[PDB]
Every structure is written in structure tokens, then in C-alpha cells.
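Interim report to the steering committee. The following record documents the input for vascular endothelial growth factor receptor 1 (101 residues).
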Amino acid sequence: SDTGRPFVEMYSEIPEIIHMTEGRELVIPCRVTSPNITVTLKKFPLDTLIPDGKRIIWDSRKGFIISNATYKEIGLLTCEATVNGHLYKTNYLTHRQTNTI
């Protein structure tokens, strides 16, 4: 919803703890109702994970699909979207799961 909230799903208060593993298909689930809106995938503080559309494939109806996760996706990611003159955001803490690399 433009005059409501772009995201289908968002964090509550605590960032979404994604128990990831390197080399795997890391989806950051911050999809939007209308693809037109177009989300920008930041990382704390003001880093920018540009959706290259090769490895980092921006599926508006699923999430940001980093086909092969790396150290560049280990931290506090922040999906951001300015809509009706209002900045919405949602946070995703990408934790290296205690399984392997």
C-alpha cells in the first residue's frame, strides 16, 4: 500500500535474525506490494548493497536473493523505501549460523 506501507512483511523492533551460511542463497525478505516502488538494500551505517541483478537479484515478490552469500552480507542489513513522502525501513541481522562457514 502506497498510503500505508510498501513492505508485505517487516521487522517488529528487533532486527530479523537470519541464521545464514556462506555460499548459500541468502534471501532478505523485504518484498513490496507494488514492484514499481523499488527497495534500496542498505547496510549499517550507510553502506549500499547495489542489486547487480547477477548475484544480488532483487525479487520484489520474494526478497533480495544473494545467490552466493559472502562477508559483504554478514551484518545489520536495512531495506529502505521512500513512498508517500515517508521513509519506511526494515532490518535484517545476518548472523553466521554455528554450523560451518
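The first strand starts at residue 16 and ends at 20. The committee is asked to note this result when reviewing the revised timeline.
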